[PDB]
UniProtKB/TrEMBL annotation:
Protein's name according to its UniProt entry: CRISPR type III-associated protein domain-containing protein
Source organism phylogeny: Bacteria, Bacillati, Cyanobacteriota, Cyanophyceae, Synechococcales
Residues of the full protein shown: 342 to 455 of 795
Signal sequence residues: none
RNA sequence: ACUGAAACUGUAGUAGAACCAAUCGGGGUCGUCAAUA
């Protein structure tokens, strides 16, 4: 098949990583309201990712504290703007179809995440 | 159809009385980290 999409890239950020992702926009879609609680959760989540490694990246370390050869995941090296959840930014949404609606539980920067 | 003269706006009086640059804070301490395939 062919599709349009956005490439979601995070760096070679754990050792087994081979492939980035392309969010296939072409085919099917569901718009859901972005509440303040979701966006403030994202801010708290991404500030966590950034602050916990501030000492690491100031030391000039290039990757995770116990996984050599990996490289910092994008949201960690990204600036304050990554916390902001601005228009057109890409996320993973944790979703379930409870009560007959697509409930969005949380927004996450990676598949297996903080 | 003759300019008056001569005479220190000086003398006495404290920009001061009162008010705390101060109140709280052990130079301390432990769990991961990372997201794919």
């Amino acid at each position: 098949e062919q599709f349009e999409g956005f490439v979601y890239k995070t760096n070679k950020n754990i050792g087994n990583k081979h492939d980035e992702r392309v969010f296939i926009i072409d085919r099917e879609s569901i718009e859901i309201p972005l509440s303040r609680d979701l966006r403030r959760k994202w801010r708290e989540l991404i500030t966590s990712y950034q602050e916990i490694h501030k000492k690491e990246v100031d030391r000039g370390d290039t990757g995770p504290s116990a996984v050599n050869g990996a490289v910092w995941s994008r949201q960690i090296i990204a600036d304050e703007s990554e916390r902001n959840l601005s228009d057109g930014t890409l996320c993973y949404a944790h979703v379930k179809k409870e009560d007959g609606q697509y409930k969005i539980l949380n927004l996450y920067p990676v598949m297996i995440t903080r």
